[model samples]
Target chain A: GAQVIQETIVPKEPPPEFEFIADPPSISAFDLDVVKLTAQFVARNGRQFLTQLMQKEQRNYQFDFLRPQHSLFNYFTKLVEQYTK
Target chain B: GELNAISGPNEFAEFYNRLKQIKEFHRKHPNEICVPMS
Candidate 1:
């Protein structure tokens, strides 16, 4: 999917998206610690605003969260490719 | 960072069992990584 733009195996609701809870949200976590924890994971694992996440070995973490090819990362990747070109 | 020792020349055996435990966590704990691609 990352290599070819047409390789879209996109699912409707991908795998609860790795929540802090053992289960996905059945209700709002707007006022819950799990929500807070999830945010923390994103912040920490999100790579200091620049680095690509490294923990993703099986699934495309960057691709799943980043999309439309105009995203910050997608754009940056394109920019890098262009620069390299 | 907590560094666990992996000793010996063919040291894979020492950490092999422990790595399996971690693998279990990574594999069976939940599909955290693949979940997003589900």
Candidate 2:
């Protein structure tokens, strides 16, 4: 005579849970310097050209030079003068 | 200024040409900043 037995197995521990948190947006001075250098590079063409380049670069944000009272505009103007001289 | 190397009277020609050099240097050493020649 023979006897057959069936068995089932289950995990003794519960699955681990996870929590996700997002960090705040931050920019470093080095990154700012890079942006400034990019501004200088694009300024070689002119204001409109810089605007076009920024748009092409997907930085359609409110650029400092476009503001009514921003010194960056003056800086770009000076840069353009030096560039086109 | 860091950009002084590429700034000058003939900056139009200087800018584009130095830009090429910078891009080439960047291609080789992406982690380093390429200071253009004066």
Candidate 3:
């Protein structure tokens, strides 16, 4: 239900090549998505991303039954930085 | 998320803290944020 779709519009002419390029990523390690417009799209929309994650991962919302020293914690932090901004 | 691991209370608290930070950041920088990988 949350899958994304692409639409194409034929242009009169080919689009110009991008003149701008992003600066190199100074750091290597990073956190890294979902459906409906793609995880990347929702991520760019930080608020929505969390909402979806929260709903889809509802089990993750409960801490009462959690074990000690979970690794998902670290991943969550990493995800926070990337998706937050 | 191949970096798979466990689930716990402290981890939950950490997520809560960070989520709060992100919401605060969003309050200030609404227009500047972008899709993470795109």
Highest TM-score scorer: 2
Greater lDDT among 1 and 3 belongs to: 3
RMSD of each: 18.5, 20.1, 16.7
Task: Kindly list the per-residue Cα lDDT of model 3 for residues A2-66, writing each as its tens digit.
Answer: 99966454445444466965745532122221121123343555555446555656575332112
Q: Can you tell me which runs of candidate 2 are displaced by over 4 Å?
A: A1-36, A54-62, A66-69, B1-38
Alpha-carbon deviation at A19 in model 3, angstroms? 53
Write the candidate numbers in order of decreasing lDDT.
2, 3, 1
Error of 2 at A25 (Å): 22
lDDT of 1: 0.37
Q: Which candidate achieves the best lDDT against the true structure?
A: 2
Instruction: Please give, for residues A1-85, the per-residue lDDT of candidate 2 as tens digits.
Output: 5897654545653433777658335543333444455566665556666666445544544354544365455654565566553
Off by over 4 Å in 1: A1-14, A18-85, B1-10, B30-38
Best by DockQ: 2
**Local distance difference test, per candidate?**
0.37, 0.51, 0.42
Output the worst ten-in-a-row residue range by lDDT, candidate 2 chain A: A23-32
1 versus 3: better TM-score goes to: 3
Calculate each model's fnat, 2 decimals.
0.00, 0.08, 0.00
**lDDT of candidate 2 at residue A6, scale 0 to 100:** 54
lDDT of 2 by residue, B1-38 (tens): 24656445654465456556655743454333456564
Worst lDDT run of 10 residues, candidate 3 chain A, spans A28-37
Candidate 3, residue B5: the lDDT equals 60
